[PDB]
mmCIF file of C-alpha atoms (C1' of nucleotides) in Angstrom:
data_model
loop_
_atom_site.group_PDB
_atom_site.id
_atom_site.type_symbol
_atom_site.label_atom_id
_atom_site.label_comp_id
_atom_site.label_asym_id
_atom_site.label_seq_id
_atom_site.Cartn_x
_atom_site.Cartn_y
_atom_site.Cartn_z
ATOM 1 C CA UNK A 1 27.558 -35.629 -7.603
ATOM 2 C CA UNK A 2 27.944 -32.996 -10.385
ATOM 3 C CA UNK A 3 30.855 -30.706 -10.787
ATOM 4 C CA UNK A 4 31.139 -27.213 -8.320
ATOM 5 C CA UNK A 5 30.047 -24.018 -9.301
ATOM 6 C CA UNK A 6 33.618 -22.646 -10.305
ATOM 7 C CA UNK A 7 33.749 -24.602 -13.299
ATOM 8 C CA UNK A 8 30.390 -23.187 -14.484
ATOM 9 C CA UNK A 9 31.421 -19.864 -13.881
ATOM 10 C CA UNK A 10 34.667 -20.039 -16.114
ATOM 11 C CA UNK A 11 32.448 -21.288 -18.746
ATOM 12 C CA UNK A 12 30.087 -18.612 -18.302
ATOM 13 C CA UNK A 13 32.910 -15.902 -18.337
ATOM 14 C CA UNK A 14 34.193 -17.923 -21.535
ATOM 15 C CA UNK A 15 30.481 -18.257 -23.224
ATOM 16 C CA UNK A 16 30.538 -14.634 -24.490
ATOM 17 C CA UNK A 17 33.769 -12.866 -23.940
ATOM 18 C CA UNK A 18 32.663 -9.169 -24.692
ATOM 19 C CA UNK A 19 34.904 -6.175 -24.322
ATOM 20 C CA UNK A 20 33.824 -5.701 -20.788
ATOM 21 C CA UNK A 21 33.751 -8.031 -18.167
ATOM 22 C CA UNK A 22 30.410 -10.342 -17.560
ATOM 23 C CA UNK A 23 27.852 -8.638 -14.949
ATOM 24 C CA UNK A 24 26.547 -10.620 -11.959
ATOM 25 C CA UNK A 25 23.027 -10.957 -13.669
ATOM 26 C CA UNK A 26 24.588 -12.139 -16.941
ATOM 27 C CA UNK A 27 26.158 -15.080 -15.164
ATOM 28 C CA UNK A 28 23.029 -15.676 -12.904
ATOM 29 C CA UNK A 29 20.851 -15.836 -16.002
ATOM 30 C CA UNK A 30 23.840 -18.024 -17.537
ATOM 31 C CA UNK A 31 23.423 -20.446 -14.763
ATOM 32 C CA UNK A 32 19.550 -20.328 -15.171
ATOM 33 C CA UNK A 33 20.097 -21.391 -19.026
ATOM 34 C CA UNK A 34 22.640 -24.078 -18.248
ATOM 35 C CA UNK A 35 20.463 -25.313 -15.329
ATOM 36 C CA UNK A 36 21.519 -24.192 -11.727
ATOM 37 C CA UNK A 37 19.270 -23.270 -8.784
ATOM 38 C CA UNK A 38 20.613 -19.575 -8.471
ATOM 39 C CA UNK A 39 17.763 -18.758 -6.098
ATOM 40 C CA UNK A 40 19.141 -20.579 -2.885
ATOM 41 C CA UNK A 41 22.684 -19.798 -3.971
ATOM 42 C CA UNK A 42 23.148 -16.021 -3.796
ATOM 43 C CA UNK A 43 25.431 -16.624 -0.944
ATOM 44 C CA UNK A 44 27.314 -19.439 -2.627
ATOM 45 C CA UNK A 45 27.877 -17.432 -5.562
ATOM 46 C CA UNK A 46 29.156 -14.680 -3.770
ATOM 47 C CA UNK A 47 31.730 -16.529 -2.154
ATOM 48 C CA UNK A 48 32.521 -18.336 -5.232
ATOM 49 C CA UNK A 49 33.324 -15.336 -7.189
ATOM 50 C CA UNK A 50 35.161 -13.772 -4.484
ATOM 51 C CA UNK A 51 37.158 -16.986 -4.098
ATOM 52 C CA UNK A 52 37.663 -16.904 -7.649
ATOM 53 C CA UNK A 53 38.923 -13.784 -7.814
ATOM 54 C CA UNK A 54 41.262 -14.091 -4.875
ATOM 55 C CA UNK A 55 43.095 -16.307 -6.764
ATOM 56 C CA UNK A 56 43.621 -13.866 -9.680
ATOM 57 C CA UNK A 57 42.276 -16.772 -12.371
ATOM 58 C CA UNK A 58 39.868 -14.046 -13.003
ATOM 59 C CA UNK A 59 40.320 -10.336 -12.419
ATOM 60 C CA UNK A 60 37.846 -7.504 -11.699
ATOM 61 C CA UNK A 61 37.039 -5.016 -14.166
ATOM 62 C CA UNK A 62 35.045 -1.826 -12.785
ATOM 63 C CA UNK A 63 32.915 -2.828 -9.550
ATOM 64 C CA UNK A 64 33.878 -3.347 -5.893
ATOM 65 C CA UNK A 65 33.316 -6.766 -4.219
ATOM 66 C CA UNK A 66 30.568 -8.942 -5.637
ATOM 67 C CA UNK A 67 29.237 -5.901 -7.611
ATOM 68 C CA UNK A 68 30.385 -4.659 -11.398
ATOM 69 C CA UNK A 69 31.945 -6.912 -14.106
ATOM 70 C CA UNK A 70 34.109 -9.685 -14.606
ATOM 71 C CA UNK A 71 36.726 -10.777 -16.927
ATOM 72 C CA UNK A 72 39.197 -13.567 -17.244
ATOM 73 C CA UNK A 73 42.889 -13.135 -16.446
ATOM 74 C CA UNK A 74 45.401 -11.620 -18.908
ATOM 75 C CA UNK A 75 46.622 -15.904 -19.539
ATOM 76 C "C1'" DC B 1 26.793 -0.896 -11.826
ATOM 77 C "C1'" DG B 2 24.553 -3.328 -14.965
ATOM 78 C "C1'" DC B 3 20.745 -5.102 -17.109
ATOM 79 C "C1'" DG B 4 16.200 -5.079 -19.190
ATOM 80 C "C1'" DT B 5 12.822 -2.566 -20.273
ATOM 81 C "C1'" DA B 6 9.330 1.193 -20.635
ATOM 82 C "C1'" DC B 7 8.002 5.136 -22.435
ATOM 83 C "C1'" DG B 8 10.112 9.686 -25.872
ATOM 84 C "C1'" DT B 9 10.017 11.241 -29.565
ATOM 85 C "C1'" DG B 10 9.271 11.534 -34.349
ATOM 86 C "C1'" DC B 11 7.033 9.971 -38.326
ATOM 87 C "C1'" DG B 12 2.531 9.427 -40.779
ATOM 88 C "C1'" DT B 13 -2.950 8.775 -40.401
ATOM 89 C "C1'" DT B 14 -7.898 8.943 -39.048
ATOM 90 C "C1'" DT B 15 -10.509 11.328 -36.970
ATOM 91 C "C1'" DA B 16 -13.491 13.803 -34.829
ATOM 92 C "C1'" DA B 17 -13.014 18.279 -32.017
ATOM 93 C "C1'" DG B 18 -13.766 22.731 -33.374
ATOM 94 C "C1'" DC B 19 -16.078 26.091 -36.005
ATOM 95 C "C1'" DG B 20 -19.822 28.684 -38.606
ATOM 96 C "C1'" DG B 21 -25.066 28.636 -39.296
ATOM 97 C "C1'" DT B 22 -29.860 27.648 -37.940
ATOM 98 C "C1'" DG B 23 -34.099 25.814 -35.680
ATOM 99 C "C1'" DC B 24 -37.070 24.862 -31.309
ATOM 100 C "C1'" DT B 25 -37.919 24.660 -27.266
ATOM 101 C "C1'" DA B 26 -38.261 24.113 -22.520
ATOM 102 C "C1'" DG B 27 -36.898 25.679 -18.776
ATOM 103 C "C1'" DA B 28 -35.414 30.370 -16.345
ATOM 104 C "C1'" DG B 29 -37.149 33.667 -14.710
ATOM 105 C "C1'" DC B 30 -40.403 37.466 -13.897
ATOM 106 C "C1'" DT B 31 -45.116 39.063 -12.034
ATOM 107 C "C1'" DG B 32 -49.363 38.394 -9.522
ATOM 108 C "C1'" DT B 33 -52.061 35.883 -5.845
ATOM 109 C "C1'" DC B 34 -53.191 33.888 -1.817
ATOM 110 C "C1'" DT B 35 -53.629 30.647 1.408
ATOM 111 C "C1'" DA B 36 -50.706 28.080 4.519
ATOM 112 C "C1'" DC B 37 -47.435 28.848 8.149
ATOM 113 C "C1'" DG B 38 -44.559 30.861 11.435
ATOM 114 C "C1'" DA B 39 -43.355 34.645 15.102
ATOM 115 C "C1'" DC B 40 -44.661 36.592 19.197
ATOM 116 C "C1'" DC B 41 -46.227 36.445 23.569
ATOM 117 C "C1'" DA B 42 -49.223 35.751 28.424
ATOM 118 C "C1'" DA B 43 -49.435 32.002 31.737
ATOM 119 C "C1'" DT B 44 -48.260 27.920 33.579
ATOM 120 C "C1'" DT B 45 -46.330 23.528 34.466
ATOM 121 C "C1'" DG B 46 -42.840 19.214 34.179
ATOM 122 C "C1'" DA B 47 -38.685 17.649 32.344
ATOM 123 C "C1'" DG B 48 -33.519 19.140 32.932
ATOM 124 C "C1'" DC B 49 -30.010 20.263 35.842
ATOM 125 C "C1'" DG B 50 -27.404 21.292 40.519
ATOM 126 C "C1'" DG B 51 -26.716 19.096 45.092
ATOM 127 C "C1'" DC B 52 -25.416 14.845 47.180
ATOM 128 C "C1'" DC B 53 -25.051 9.949 48.909
ATOM 129 C "C1'" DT B 54 -24.137 5.409 48.427
ATOM 130 C "C1'" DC B 55 -21.344 0.816 45.710
ATOM 131 C "C1'" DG B 56 -19.734 -2.388 42.305
ATOM 132 C "C1'" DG B 57 -17.351 -1.786 38.188
ATOM 133 C "C1'" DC B 58 -13.052 -0.967 37.933
ATOM 134 C "C1'" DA B 59 -7.755 0.348 38.689
ATOM 135 C "C1'" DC B 60 -3.991 -1.339 41.429
ATOM 136 C "C1'" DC B 61 -1.688 -5.386 43.220
ATOM 137 C "C1'" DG B 62 -0.015 -10.199 42.997
ATOM 138 C "C1'" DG B 63 0.485 -15.102 41.554
ATOM 139 C "C1'" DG B 64 1.002 -18.515 37.829
ATOM 140 C "C1'" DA B 65 0.730 -19.988 31.645
ATOM 141 C "C1'" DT B 66 1.465 -18.850 27.488
ATOM 142 C "C1'" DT B 67 3.502 -17.369 23.589
ATOM 143 C "C1'" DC B 68 7.342 -14.426 21.735
ATOM 144 C "C1'" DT B 69 12.277 -14.239 21.365
ATOM 145 C "C1'" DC B 70 16.556 -15.654 21.242
ATOM 146 C "C1'" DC B 71 20.264 -18.603 21.638
ATOM 147 C "C1'" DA B 72 22.307 -23.122 21.810
ATOM 148 C "C1'" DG B 73 22.638 -27.546 20.160
ATOM 149 C "C1'" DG B 74 23.411 -29.439 16.361
ATOM 150 C "C1'" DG B 75 21.993 -31.178 12.234
ATOM 151 C "C1'" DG B 76 22.177 -31.576 7.930
ATOM 152 C "C1'" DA B 77 22.386 -29.470 3.103
ATOM 153 C "C1'" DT B 78 25.104 -28.853 0.045
ATOM 154 C "C1'" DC B 79 29.755 -26.860 -0.982
ATOM 155 C "C1'" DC B 80 34.724 -26.007 -1.057
ATOM 156 C "C1'" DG B 81 38.254 -28.429 -0.566
ATOM 157 C "C1'" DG B 82 39.794 -32.366 -1.316
ATOM 158 C "C1'" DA B 83 40.404 -37.615 -0.645
ATOM 159 C "C1'" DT B 84 39.989 -40.759 -3.767
ATOM 160 C "C1'" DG B 85 37.584 -44.168 -6.958
ATOM 161 C "C1'" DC B 86 38.349 -45.685 -10.706
ATOM 162 C "C1'" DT B 87 38.610 -44.952 -14.428
#
DNA sequence: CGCGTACGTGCGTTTAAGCGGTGCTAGAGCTGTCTACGACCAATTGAGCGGCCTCGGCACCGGGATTCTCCAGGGGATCCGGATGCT
């Protein structure tokens, strides 16, 4: 089975936690370093990030849609 | 917009370009010869082009396969949710 991508993205945004949000390229490279097939899952990571920001668990800093930088919620 | 990177620039260092000087020569160039060669021209011809006439290679027409495209099925790959196993 294996944990879905959303928990991996939460660990990715919690890995560094610099002042600005974590970027799309940084989270892709974080998935590559932790171990993930980022090549065939671009639509997957796009829909996953949109789904998680729609819940409000993570908020958008600067960009629009899948672009920009991504940082976690208030609490 | 963001990330990775690839020059920009600013320091020092080595060097070889740059400058000044000198000798030698080999080729540039000028002059004289003269011989090979091209221009010109009378005469005349055979190749080169207009005219013409036929015909088969080809442009148009039509019928059938094949490959490209697109769409539908649908399959399945793996995922997002989740059902849930079981822990």
